[PDB]
């Protein structure tokens, strides 16, 4: 086949300019297409042959000779904030590489720990909830039941429309029989030069 690599899965743009790069495992002869895909929508054609638009606003331009192709959006608005894929049509086995844009904001994480309720404790289970509602970047969550644990489920939304901050839900499922290990702590590590620890006993 042929591999198409998009190095940056997430990119930061602030209504100025964005340059998305696609790399190829073989010289494709400038046979590269670029697709726009909003979440919940099918991929839509933007550029074929790496230099030709197909009924798109003029801010979406594309260049690239061989083995390194680029798509530039010099007018990036809220419609431009979506995912973009790069396809090569040099070989029989077609390929993609995905990439997404993100806005530019500040920083500052928040955390909150919540014990399982009595209704859940009655029905043979205990789910401890760790909420990280507003932060920017990437974050890591560790569970400490006086010892590290790696049996929790983690979920992350997209980006907030207004606050422009990411969130994270960590659910730690522990049975009632194993519900005596001491205390439960949720620790969040971000780019803040120190972890945020919230604990219950």
């Amino acid at each position: 086949a042929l591999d198409i690599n998009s190095p940056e899965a997430e990119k930061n743009a602030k209504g100025a300019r964005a340059r998305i790069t696609c790399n190829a495992g073989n010289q494709v002869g400038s046979a590269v297409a670029w697709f726009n895909q909003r979440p919940g929508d099918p991929a839509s054609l933007l550029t074929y042959w790496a230099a030709t638009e197909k009924g798109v606003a003029g801010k979406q331009s594309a260049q690239g000779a061989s083995t390194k192709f680029s798509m530039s959006s010099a007018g990036p608005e809220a419609p431009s904030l979506s995912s973009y894929w790069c396809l090569l049509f040099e070989k029989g086995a077609f390929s993609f590489g995905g990439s997404k844009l993100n806005p530019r904001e500040g920083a500052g994480p928040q955390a909150s720990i919540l014990p399982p309720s009595a209704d859940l404790n009655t029905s043979g289970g205990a789910a401890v909830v760790c909420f990280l509602p507003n932060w920017y970047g990437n974050i890591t969550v560790q569970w400490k039941t006086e010892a590290p644990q790696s049996q929790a489920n983690m979920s992350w939304p997209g980006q907030a429309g207004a606050n422009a901050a990411y969130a994270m839900a960590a659910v730690l499922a522990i049975t009632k029989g194993d519900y005596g290990p001491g205390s439960f702590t949720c620790n969040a590590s971000n780019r803040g030069t120190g972890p945020f620890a919230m604990s219950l006993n």
Partner: protein, 203 residues
């Protein structure tokens, strides 16, 4: 205008055979190839393509798992999926331009390869107790097999997380950052009639 329309979501059980249709309007189907694409909330794969007047090509990964047919009397391309287990994804159908090799128009169908259908359980998680500015509550919905829509009574500060797979069921969390706490309730709704609403108390 060229447009392809696909069938609705399907929920096969384990290793059942699922057929996805793709009807095509606005162009002769026999002149252009039809390509199928694979997206499991990630980058795109290419399963196969079918020419409506002859040969059908498959990628080596999907050889024996996918079967492509084309009915030119109704211009409908059918993709048949056999064994499953990790194929719960979005299968897109799009016609290739017969000149270059790219895809101008796209469709999209959903496939969920799971088993079971149960009612969700709602737990109104609250704060164990502290004092620092505004308060943050929570609501946990665990143990279902559909797409819910968690809501709050007229409050727009909520964050509803994407559901995650646990066992063979789905779990979802919701967070609300409220300043004052006179009274709050969490309302959710299940794909089926299943739907209830539980208030959030203290401690």
């Amino acid at each position: 205008a060229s447009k392809l329309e696909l069938s609705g979501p399907a929920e096969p059980r384990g290793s059942k055979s699922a057929q996805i249709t793709c009807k095509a309007k606005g162009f002769p189907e026999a002149r252009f190839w039809v390509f199928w694409l694979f997206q499991r909330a990630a980058a795109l794969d290419w399963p196969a393509a079918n020419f409506s007047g002859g040969p059908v090509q498959f990628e080596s990964r999907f050889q024996g798992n996918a079967s492509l047919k084309g009915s030119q009397a109704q211009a409908n391309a059918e993709l048949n999926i056999g064994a499953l287990g990790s194929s719960t994804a979005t299968y897109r159908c799009g016609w290739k331009l017969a000149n270059g090799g790219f895809f101008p128009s796209w469709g999209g169908a959903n496939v969920n390869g799971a088993a079971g259908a149960k009612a969700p359980a709602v737990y109104p998680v609250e704060i164990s107790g502290a004092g620092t500015g505004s308060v943050t509550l929570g609501c946990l919905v665990k143990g279902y097999n559909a797409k819910p829509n968690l809501t709050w009574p007229g409050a727009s500060g909520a964050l509803t997380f994407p559901s995650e797979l646990n066992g063979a069921l789905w779990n979802l969390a919701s967070a609300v950052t409220g300043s004052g706490f006179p009274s709050a309730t969490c309302a959710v709704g299940f794909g089926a009639a299943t739907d209830v609403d539980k208030k959030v108390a203290a401690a």
